[model samples]
Target: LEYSELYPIQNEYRMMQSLDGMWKFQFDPEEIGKKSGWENGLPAPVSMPVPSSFADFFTDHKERDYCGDFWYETEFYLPAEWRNKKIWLRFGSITHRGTVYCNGMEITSHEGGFLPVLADISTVAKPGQVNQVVVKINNELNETSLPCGATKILNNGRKLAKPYFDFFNYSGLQRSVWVIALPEESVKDYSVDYELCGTDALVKYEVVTTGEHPVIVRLLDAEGELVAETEGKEGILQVANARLWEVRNAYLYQIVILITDGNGVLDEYREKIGIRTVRIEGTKILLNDRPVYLKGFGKHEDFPILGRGFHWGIVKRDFECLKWTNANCFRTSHYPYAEEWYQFADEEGFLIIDEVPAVGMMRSFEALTVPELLKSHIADTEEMITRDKNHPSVIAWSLFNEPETITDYAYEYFKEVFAAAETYDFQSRPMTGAFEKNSKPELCKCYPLCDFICLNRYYGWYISGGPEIEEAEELFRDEMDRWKAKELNVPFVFTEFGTDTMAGLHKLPSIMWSEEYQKEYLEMNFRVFDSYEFVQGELAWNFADFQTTEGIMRVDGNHKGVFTRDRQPKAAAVVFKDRWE
Candidate 1:
């Protein structure tokens, strides 16, 4: 069965009911939820919010760090008239792994936590009655998973998730869930590619539907006036004069797709799309055929209590901060975010490098080139491209972050993965991965496969710090000189570079972890970036502080953010505001 790429929206032919509220949650430390028939219902369960991580709510460390099978149950009513229509349970996301059951029957199972999981419950769902939905979620990460990690069973028979990545494993139903009703034979998926003439735009569209009804597509301007229309499963619509979606200035055109027979309309779908193109020039990234430089941060979807949950207030605040900083771009670092984030970016005109959760492919600096790793990574790449291909804000696709790229096995593994991404993405967005120091130009075998180069360097902070910053700059310049000598003729972007700074700490001479040192660190990095002609963009290490595994090095969480975890500005924010503005 194919998962629909279309997001659930209420329209003339569709209805949606959000399943976003408190639900019965239970932790199965012994992995006995399924054996005990928790699919029927959860016993002795506590109320947990649907769209928040279960980790932060618990006071006990054992419960907070719990890893294994957990179950969530909720009930919703299905109208009798909906019996003739198709029913789907849509999960915005469930961390790592999930299995769905409707009315005590197995429906669908999904891997990867960053994308949507659609379960068709038409057959198992009973109309005119209350329906029970149960989801079994596994928070453990392993080499076979996209965000690779290991599960260690302790002496007390408890499972511990030891992640290779730096961030904390914030797990649960991290996004919203909804029950949707649609036509039996409705619009399934669609894709759009654009061609720009002098003053006109040609949008070539291909649509997929379940039924063989004639497809009618119409393009409407922001004023709600129809500009162009076409009929077929595939065709082109031409606009005489087009308003382009520019950087930080978005112009959206709505596409109305209708599946109709001779008598009446069977299904109708609407999507807002922007007419823009992204390509890599010699040493620049172009938007709408104009050179555009990326200035933003590599951000995480994290908060104090929400823990990767989708909150509209946080989204608005982040974008406001981005605008205040005069930034125009950001990367969904390590993983793809909620779909609403892309929608907002589309409207706000912020460039995005949409990434897959292909982090931590290296175990102890060695490549985990297992067959399962390749299989899951390719599947995730396909899902990510399929879901976010139409978003105008997404300028590129990041395949992995800081993986072991020096090995021949890693080279072969990523080559196949990149090939799969090339095949899957119809938009043909530039594809690249964020490389760390280990994947230097001289050592990395997979950099040649990338359309552009993305480097995540920590020169003064990780390599040489405090008194050796000048030496660190020399070593940083040496690496860039080596890359410049290769003359790959591709754009290079600094995807990450920053130092941990306390929100208010200051020092006279600028010591490490001080706000003054953070400001100085960015200045040094910017000087080097300005010196390189091929460098196209500089996205700082983080937008805000975020939670991570407990360690002596981390005070509460990673403090590399220009903003505090609560979204307050640090002194480094002033440096970026000065430079980017």
Candidate 2:
């Protein structure tokens, strides 16, 4: 795709000090407790790469299903001169469970995945002594938010389920591992919100601080001119702007705020931030008051060479691929992905739809029937937004994906979860969770309760026959149009499309990747998308091939990707980008 690289971290920092590199690692047995001592948990035998899964080193190791303890050990000495600096151990993300320890001293541990977390340890690191940092990642699948039970068909003609997806779930320091070297005091975190009101002047900002600190807020105009500046002891400082953040029309400026100890030296930090106002009208997604089509791929949290390993390079490549295909948006699908992925999307100017990690269970009624399963599902929704609200790229918060059953339990699930979303995000974008039913009569009635309505239609895939794709696409179009026909005003999006393509894109009668078949099939699908005024956005079911257990499609029921598992583009990639162009 488009191969362009931009500095993801806008603020430059020394790379060697970035703490993102090779580290000593060992794949602990699935067994709960074990100890092999030496070198301060320094993994002997061999050193494994950070940003790659611990599973990669243990592919052949038994207990492949072990999603339990995967331990990482590395050694480093505190820079002698930095004795007075506040040392922070930062982790971009850990799986479902993790604990960070420094020289056997517990630093921090967190639940859920995504979001960068830090632990201050200036007092712990000796001035000249080598320190030990051990991070253990446990991404177990408990049917709560393992994305529909974590079972994907393997390439080996077997279904690998639970704690492991079809693609590898590379554990251990997936996203960039960092140590934030802050002064004794620094801006730990900051936030602000605006509602387009009246003249829609971008108004309202509330920046909160952990403790009392001197903070300065500066509003910069589009040309980077100083418009307004305020110094206050209180953490909050607000502004009233005559301009609002409108899609593609009139994007406003941002206020840069930083907190320091008052000697021009900084400790804790914050940028009140600048944001382009984005809105939605009818079925058309808007940017800065201008209509921008929501055309992008839905990305899974899986990677080649490292599986679920969180690599900044891989995220950079994902953005490049999207740009080459003229994609301007991304859907962090299935579950939440590495928080850094959103950073890449923001710097690259892509619209993002961030979703909570409740999946695979709605399709199977049994998953939601269990109350414990539902409890964890609720926790994931809260955790998803709690960690990702400040991100500029994120627009909407998706509830769950492709829930097939709509029982009372399901309705309550949506109601309680969405009710919780009311306090989650301060942005103007609408909220929704996609629901797909196989037998029920299509209904927009349910959407009235939710924000904008989103539907996932497989069309031709499940329906038997050559006409299934066309007929299904048409059925979708007709359903959406009927809503407008009835004057029931609600925006709708086509979140899932595409068929199994394993024929290798040759355009033959082959079963998969028949270039001819996929193109012909997808062209019809795209034509349908083009014909519908209500169809304002669409995210092809997936960006790449993933593992699946249901033998519906080839390669373990996972042939829906535009690219193969290894990140190679298929014939359909070129075709879609061409049509979009």
* Winner by lDDT: 1
Root-mean-square deviation of each candidate, in angstroms?
A: 1.2, 5.8
Number of clashing pairs, model 1?
A: 0
Over 1-581, each residue of candidate 2 has an lDDT whose tens digit, in order, gives: 01101112223221114666788765554333235542257444357677665554555634444455667777776667567766667666676567788877777776556545566676787766787788776655556544445544455433334532333444467666665454454444444555444443443455554446677776776667776666753333334554443322234355565665657635323232435555666655666566777787777877655757776777777777887887777788767777677656655666777887666554334444466666656666655675566655777778777664446555665676677777656563567777675424343234555556666766566653354555766675675566567664556676777776773546445343465666666776777767756667777867878754334334554677887777778788998798667
Error of 1 at 18 (Å): 0.4
Query: Model 1: which residue pairs collide?
Result: none
lDDT of each: 0.91, 0.61
Error in Å for residue 479 of model 1: 0.8
Model 1 misplaced regions, further than 4 Å = 365-369
Q: Write the per-residue lDDT of candidate 1 for residues 311-331, one digit (tens) a residue.
A: 888999999999999999999
Task: Evaluate model 2: give its lDDT.
Answer: 0.61
Clashes per candidate, residues 3 or more apart or on different chains: 0, 39
- Per-candidate TM-scores read 0.99, 0.81
